[PDB]
């Protein structure tokens, strides 16, 4: 999904292995704030949210807690107290296109700043000039920003990047999102220390 209308998915009641991905070494950006990223699927949260969108490399630095700029103020904003992770990888081979891929749009105008992570639900028009627009996009009254021009022969700052933001919800509820149960082989006829799943 484009950054103005990013896609949030809730995840609960399942087994997750983070070290396959965190240790996969396949992403260009993997920054975790709050929780340690290094093999800390030894925790259990109520819900896990995954927010997916598309930006450009120049803007990847703007998808971060308490960041300011076009995308952060107008497209996707994260709060400073972000207890989560951000992953991102260059998708020029998948989101570019000969003659340009113009499918991703970004919001360029807003009266205020974005209140921690919202998306292009209400997508109206905003007055960007002196007096009322009263209709057809025109003089001192237009659209937000255009499409992204993700041509494959772009500079890195202009190339498409796919971003997934994972948030970890731990409310006053039974936590169900845990990761592995590293079982071991069993033995017999010898005094041992045991841990029989609890």
């Amino acid at each position, epitope marked *: 999904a484009s950054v103005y209308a990013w896609n949030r998915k809730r995840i609960s009641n399942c087994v997750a292995d983070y070290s396959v991905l965190y240790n996969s070494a396949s992403f260009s950006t993997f920054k975790c704030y709050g929780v340690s990223p290094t093999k800390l699927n030894d925790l259990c949260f109520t819900n896990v949210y995954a927010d997916s969108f598309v930006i450009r490399g120049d803007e990847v630095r703007q998808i971060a807690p308490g960041q300011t700029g076009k995308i952060a103020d107008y497209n996707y904003k994260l709060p400073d107290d972000f207890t989560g992770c951000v992953i991102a990888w260059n998708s020029n081979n998948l989101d570019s296109k000969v003659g340009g891929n113009y499918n991703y749009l970004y919001r*360029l*105008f807003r009266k205020s700043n974005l209140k921690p992570f919202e998306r292009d639900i209400s997508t109206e028009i905003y007055q*960007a*000039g*002196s007096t009322p627009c009263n209709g*057809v996009e*025109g003089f001192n009254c237009y*659209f937000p920003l*255009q499409s992204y021009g993700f041509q494959p022969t772009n500079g890195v700052g202009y190339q498409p990047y796919r971003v997934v933001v994972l948030s970890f919800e731990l409310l006053h509820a039974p936590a169900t999102v845990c990761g592995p149960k590293k079982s071991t082989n069993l033995v017999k006829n010898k005094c041992v220390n045991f841990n029989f799943n609890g």
Partner: antibody
Amino acid sequence: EVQLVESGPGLVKPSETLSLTCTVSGGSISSSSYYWGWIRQPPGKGLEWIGSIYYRGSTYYNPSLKSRVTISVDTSKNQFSLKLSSVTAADTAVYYCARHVRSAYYYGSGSYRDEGNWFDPWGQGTLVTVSS
Amino acid sequence: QSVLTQPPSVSGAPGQRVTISCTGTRSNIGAGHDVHWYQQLPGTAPKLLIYGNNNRPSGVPDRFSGAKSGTSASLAITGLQAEDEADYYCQSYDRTLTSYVFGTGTKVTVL
């Protein structure tokens, strides 16, 4: 990388309709907020704004010449045509067409200045004489 | 009415300060939408030299400055150099005519 080229008749008689064509490259007249304008320069004088057209077919003309000036676009050929009715020898001058890149200077206030000020790129110009 | 007023020429010797005035009306230089300055050879595409009364586009030497007050504006060239031998035009939107009005222009020569 931006090119503009004006074409038309070098001599027109008074009261007749003048048709000038501007062929451009380096930009599309279909881009959001992009503009295409016409400007005149009378003999040995300063530049005089004539009219402007937008990607959305909106257009303005100088009020004193509004009723006699008409600008049209042809997206398929990336061309702009200017027609001037009831011409007179007073309209003899060099005509320039020009590109206006989306809104204003987007960096700095967010292009929140009508149209910044004007344009940048220019064509070679065409001299049109009105006489019978 | 349709034209901003500039002195038709301004001169000086290399290294001098040369200023160009630009006389408008209430609707453009006065209560209008700021005055810009242009610098390009006669008959060739102009190039923005000063924007928003006093901003400079990148590529314009820092020695070009603009000023506005009331219905009058000026361009200052602070250390006239051989490259400054061009035409200079001021320009501003006129709210009464609803037109973007250029100045009549000034040619500088480095004597």
